Amino acid sequence: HHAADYVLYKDATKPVEDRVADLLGRMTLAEKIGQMTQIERLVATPDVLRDNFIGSLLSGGGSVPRKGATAKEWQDMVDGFQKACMSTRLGIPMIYGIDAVHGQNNVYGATIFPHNVGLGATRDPYLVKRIGEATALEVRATGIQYAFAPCIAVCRDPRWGRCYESYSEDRRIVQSMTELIPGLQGDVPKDFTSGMPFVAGKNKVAACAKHFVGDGGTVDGINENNTIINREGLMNIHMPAYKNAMDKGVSTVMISYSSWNGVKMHANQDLVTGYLKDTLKFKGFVISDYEGIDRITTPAGSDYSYSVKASILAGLDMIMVPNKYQQFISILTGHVNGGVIPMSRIDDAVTRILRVKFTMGLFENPYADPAMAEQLGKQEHRDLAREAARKSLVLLKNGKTSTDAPLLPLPKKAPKILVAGSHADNLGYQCGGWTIEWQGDTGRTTVGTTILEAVKAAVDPSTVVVFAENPDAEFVKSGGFSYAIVAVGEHPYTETKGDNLNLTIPEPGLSTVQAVCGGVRCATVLISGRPVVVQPLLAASDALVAAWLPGSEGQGVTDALFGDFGFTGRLPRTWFKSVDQLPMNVGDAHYDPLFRLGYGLTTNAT
Numbered sequence: 001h002h003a004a005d006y007v008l009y010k011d012a013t014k015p016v017e018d019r020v021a022d023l024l025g026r027m028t029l030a031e032k033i034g035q036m037t038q039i040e041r042l043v044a045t046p047d048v049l050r051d052n053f054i055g056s057l058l059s060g061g062g063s064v065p066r067k068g069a070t071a072k073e074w075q076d077m078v079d080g081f082q083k084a085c086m087s088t089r090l091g092i093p094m095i096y097g098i099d100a101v102h103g104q105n106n107v108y109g110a111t112i113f114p115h116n117v118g119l120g121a122t123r124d125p126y127l128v129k130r131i132g133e134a135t136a137l138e139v140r141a142t143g144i145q146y147a148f149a150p151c152i153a154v155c156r157d158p159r160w161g162r163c164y165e166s167y168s169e170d171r172r173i174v175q176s177m178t179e180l181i182p183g184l185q186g187d188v189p190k191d192f193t194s195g196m197p198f199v200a201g202k203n204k205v206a207a208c209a210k211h212f213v214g215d216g217g218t219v220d221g222i223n224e225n226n227t228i229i230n231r232e233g234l235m236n237i238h239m240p241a242y243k244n245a246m247d248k249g250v251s252t253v254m255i256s257y258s259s260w261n262g263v264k265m266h267a268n269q270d271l272v273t274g275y276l277k278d279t280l281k282f283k284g285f286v287i288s289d290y291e292g293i294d295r296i297t298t299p300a301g302s303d304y305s306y307s308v309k310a311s312i313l314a315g316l317d318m319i320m321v322p323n324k325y326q327q328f329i330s331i332l333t334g335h336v337n338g339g340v341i342p343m344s345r346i347d348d349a350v351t352r353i354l355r356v357k358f359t360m361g362l363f364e365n366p367y368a369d370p371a372m373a374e375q376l377g378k379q380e381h382r383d384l385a386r387e388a389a390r391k392s393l394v395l396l397k398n399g400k401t402s403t404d405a406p407l408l409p410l411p412k413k414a415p416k417i418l419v420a421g422s423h424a425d426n427l428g429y430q431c432g433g434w435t436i437e438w439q440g441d442t443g444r445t446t447v448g449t450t451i452l453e454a455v456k457a458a459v460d461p462s463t464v465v466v467f468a469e470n471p472d473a474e475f476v477k478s479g480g481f482s483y484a485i486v487a488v489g490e491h492p493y494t495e496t497k498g499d500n501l502n503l504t505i506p507e508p509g510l511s512t513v514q515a516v517c518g519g520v521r522c523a524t525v526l527i528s529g530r531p532v533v534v535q536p537l538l539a540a541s542d543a544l545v546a547a548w549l550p551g552s553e554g555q556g557v558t559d560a561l562f563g564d565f566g567f568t569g570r571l572p573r574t575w576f577k578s579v580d581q582l583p584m585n586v587g588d589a590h591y592d593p594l595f596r597l598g599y600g601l602t603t604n605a606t
């Protein structure tokens with residue numbers, strides 16, 4: 001269609017499938033393998049990206065251009081990588097991915113939303129959708145076009161260090177929370193064919209249903225381990241939300257490190273190709289986890305050549321290498337030149353990657369929009385996060401005995417009150433893993449409001465607020481307090497670091513609760529990524545609130561504690577009596593919960 005030098009793949013008015021076929025037909029083998037290669041920004045340089053025809057970059061947890069970097073620093077980093085990719089012969093823009101799993105959580109100043117488990121407590125899919133919307137804007141504020149979210153694992157055992165990333169042990173709740181997808185990506189068209197990728201354009205991002213499949217069903221919740229269960233159980237529990245993701249046009253799927261009945265997911269052709277691609281009709285791209293193909297073997301990386309062959313023949317399209325890109329490209333190249341991996345497999349992988357890039361508009365807007373910088377940490381997104389945090393809270397107890405005055409809601413006006421505990425004034429603890437650092441961190445890591453600051457922000461100006469992290473019972477008994485708010489719980493963790501057979505909160509925790517509650521009527525705010533052993537906290541406490549990992553906006557906690565809103569959350573998981581009951585999920589014959597899934601007390605606004 002006219003102009004000197006016309007190249008159909010560069011024509012924005014053409015259909016995606018023609019632009020894909022047109023571009024695919026021009027590419028060398030090296031250009032093709034390039035597209036299949038995702039590398040860490042930590043190893044990337046303009047020359048590396050140009051010379052290896054690289055298709056994708058990522059930031060892993062904690063991989064930032066620097067500490068405290070502004071939105072525009074992120075945009076400059078991404079645009080600098082992108083300019084190297086656009087200067088290739090074919091000018092194929094790279095796509096940059098990051099774990100924005102509760103907001104754009106690696107970035108200083110980004111709104112941090114509650115983690116998934118707390119979101120499942122809300123039973124509010126429209127809320128999760130609005131969060132996907134906000135998170136897409138804060139990701140695009142940093143120039144990034146691709147979020148590795150949602151995690152739609154169905155965590156069947158909270159001893160797993162990723163239970164907090166699962167909305168529920170019940171797949172129906174997880175299915176309903178796949179509304180994150182159209183939030184991140186935009187709503188699919190009226191027509192839409194299930195399994196096609198969709199992103200609306202430059203204010204949205206490609207999403208990633210992960211980790212396929214059965215990540216939440218491992219033996220003893222051991223991370224990355226073996227999910228021992230029949231096809232019918234896999235399809236009834238772990239698969240269904242992937243079908244909802246197909247219907248919402250999810251752009252990519254990431255494969256799990258985990259195994260199904262002893263078969264590595266990264267080497268499972270029947271599931272990845274037979275099921276995901278040929279039965280669900282997924283037409284987006286399939287991406288490995290981080291060094292996921294290495295972990296196919298034991299030890300990991302001990303036959304990288306087999307890892308490439310296995311993963312690529314299984315049906316994976318893009319490999320999150322992410323460091324050893326030279327080996328990866330050299331080996332896949334040798335497999336193809338040797339006729340061990342057919343060119344049809346390479347072409348299918350590249351078709352899929354290009355299909356997502358054209359569809360999302362990446363060829364038309366390869367570069368960041370500087371005007372989006374101000375979306376980062378935007379007050380309206382914080383207000384949404386605050387609404388979420390509040391809705392995620394589950395009131396487990398409100399009065400020590402059924403005859404006591406309900407402690408909650410607390411009055412805003414009182415002569416003097418006490419805020420206490422390891423988690424009452426620690427932003428990093430309230431956000432948990434995947435915040436600033438991969439494992440999360442302690443202290444004031446970003447912009448946010450702690451529980452202490454929120455209480456000071458909410459109380460009547462005549463109310464005196466005292467903070468004491470770990471006071472003794474005498475300090476409390478002597479202080480003239482009307483009541484105390486005490487926050488304790490788990491420390492931030494992520495992945496295998498959080499696998500935990502005992503599920504008891506660290507000390508001091510319990511002993512601060514007991515010291516405070518023994519001296520004044522107390523409301524205990526428990527911060528955790530999962531149910532933990534809770535009977536001793538309960539026995540000590542007048543009221544107790546499971547606040548999960550509510551994120552950066554601690555005013556969500558106080559909004560409920562002080563009665564601006566009534567408590568509405570309900571447990572999205574079973575609260576066990578003991579870890580030796582585990583696993584124990586709603587619907588088991590088995591079933592003897594301390595609090596059943598769905599449990600939750602309410603209050604009225606004041």
Ligand SMILES: *[C@@H]1O[C@H](CO)[C@@H](O)[C@H](O)[C@H]1NC(C)=O
Pocket residue numbers: 222224225226259262
């Ligand atoms: C499961 O965990 C044990 C270590 O606790 C390990 O020996 C085993 O290989 C793991 N299985 C898989 C499939 O990852």
Ligand SMILES: *[C@@H]1O[C@H](CO)[C@@H](O)[C@H](O)[C@H]1NC(C)=O
Pocket residue numbers: 603604
């Ligand atoms: C909640 O609201 C209703 C009034 O509509 C009332 O009956 C109930 O006592 C209120 N208070 C509490 C603490 O439930």
Ligand SMILES: OC[C@H]1O[C@H](O)[C@H](O)[C@@H](O)[C@@H]1O
Pocket residue numbers: 059060061062063290438
């Ligand atoms: O899978 C392991 C890796 O994934 C994460 O995203 C991190 O950035 C890296 O530190 C960690 O080792």
Ligand SMILES: OC[C@H]1O[C@H](O)[C@H](O)[C@@H](O)[C@@H]1O
Pocket residue numbers: 059060061099148210289290495
């Ligand atoms: O950081 C990139 C990836 O690495 C991690 O190890 C996780 O398993 C995955 O969920 C994440 O998207």
